[PDB]
From a paper:
The present study focuses on the ancestor [name] from the hyperthermophilic archaeon [name]. Biochemical and structural studies showed that [name] is made of a SmsC2B2 heterotetratmer wherein the [name] subunit hosts both ATP and [Fe-S] cluster binding sites. With respect to the six components of the SUF system, [name] has only two components, [name] and SmsB, encoded by the smsCB operon. The [name] subunit, consisting of a RecA-like domain and a helical domain, contains all the structural motifs of the nucleotide-binding (NBD) subunits of the ABC ATPases (i.e., Walker A, Walker B, ABC signature, D-, Q-, and H-loops).
Residue numbers in the entry:
A (entry chain C): -2 to 239
B (entry chain A): -1 to 239
The structure:
Amino acid sequence: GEFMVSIMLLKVEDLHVYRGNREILKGVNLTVEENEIHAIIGPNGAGKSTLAYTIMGISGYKPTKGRIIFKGVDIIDKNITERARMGMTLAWQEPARFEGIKVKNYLMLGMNEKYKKDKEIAEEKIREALKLVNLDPDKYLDRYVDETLSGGERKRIELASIICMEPDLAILDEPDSGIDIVSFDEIKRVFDYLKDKGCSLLVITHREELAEHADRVSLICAGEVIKSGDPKEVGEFYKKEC
Amino acid sequence: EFMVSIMLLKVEDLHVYRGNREILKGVNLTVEENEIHAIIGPNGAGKSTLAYTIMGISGYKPTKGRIIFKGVDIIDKNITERARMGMTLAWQEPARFEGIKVKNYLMLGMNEKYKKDKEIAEEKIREALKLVNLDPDKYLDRYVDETLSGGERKRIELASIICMEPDLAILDEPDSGIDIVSFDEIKRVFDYLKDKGCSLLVITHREELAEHADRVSLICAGEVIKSGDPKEVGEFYKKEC
Ligand SMILES: Nc1ncnc2c1ncn2[C@@H]1O[C@H](COP(=O)(O)OP(N)(=O)O)[C@@H](O)[C@H]1O
Ligand SMILES: Nc1ncnc2c1ncn2[C@@H]1O[C@H](COP(=O)(O)OP(N)(=O)O)[C@@H](O)[C@H]1O
Ligand SMILES: [Zn+2]
């Protein structure tokens, strides 16, 4: 291979986002490459979740200045459904509970077409995803994705949902939240498995254990990317300056 | 010189069944007056279930054993009866009570020693926000709703505990959603609460916070496996679990 190029999957250009009265994002320049794990670190109120919501096109999160480019398309006038059709997904910090929806049915919703095309393949995929996040398929398939699950179990089911979905870009807002340490290698193996399939993860995290697993980390302070690059160097700068 | 000694909280061989599964299988746990007792352990071990059973949350009734708070068996007392005795619970993922400003939220539940004088209560709310690093002038008139970030809502919940100043504050992951550059402020909140005579029963996944407790208890499959020194119990957890 002669040329060494980099492909951009997502490009956030000088993004200014106003929430209510306050200016949360003040010119964010962020890129996500194809098959890359890009972690976003920073203090509370810096605008990390707001950045994820603006990329997903959550109602109310429209930029006043700048633009979001996904797969070379300017997605500014596209609703959350139009962005999800292109291969983008968001995992919330506290995922929704649903009465009456079983775990098997929830993991089937959003499953990649390459698995849905054959019933037996889709059933094996759900079992594989639960085993990846350390949940016994025979104990959790019949459970409901409701208030009965513990936060850690719900967070693992959300991660299994991403495996089945196999999206082009998975934005994960604190995928570690509520999950015990000891289970942190399983989270890294999920990220590795997703990278192996061609996925790109944009992970917001407070765990250095997970942020150091990314290929690139970006520090965000007061709606601005302060530093970006090596996970350990950017992490050390965070723990000392901003 | 008064020999009458009363244990703040005493959980005796507690067996709790949730749905079909037996979550707690004989829990023996005690909380002393003016003590920070951390509870560590893997997911599904029953730590949150233990906190909900102590608070008397609807559906969390024990099949065997008993819960004794301030020498009183609270088994037949509802969550409101337990809260009047000085017990409180800070849920992991707190409620967004819309149409209620942060000033009203912090005033609901405030300790009587502060409510008795309007000026004292107004200074208490400002003090609590400053303790959790929130600027009172920026957050006092804000609404507790989805507008607040998880870290901000978790800090407001901690400020609420300062104003309340309870005898026993059960905190289910008080660190969750809070950045690591603010973990000293969480420890200073625990110190401030201990200084006032409060006892905290903190469930946590951060060794940073669990090592700040006077005693840590490891729970595995509804059972206390080890208890005592925070560093020794913490090392045993990473090793065997
Ligand atoms: N409607 C609104 N009115 C006022 N302030 C608002 C708002 N919606 C959001 N905010 C504020 O904007 C900031 C955005 O925080 P967030 O993007 O969640 O920060 P983070 N996840 O990186 O911790 C927070 O300080 C939040 O309270
Ligand atoms: N109604 C229910 N049916 C079945 N299982 C139930 C249940 N309510 C709770 N559980 C289970 O109880 C277990 C205890 O979870 P929890 O007490 O939150 O554990 P933890 N805080 O230490 O992470 C979990 O594995 C959960 O799935
Ligand atoms: Zn027993």
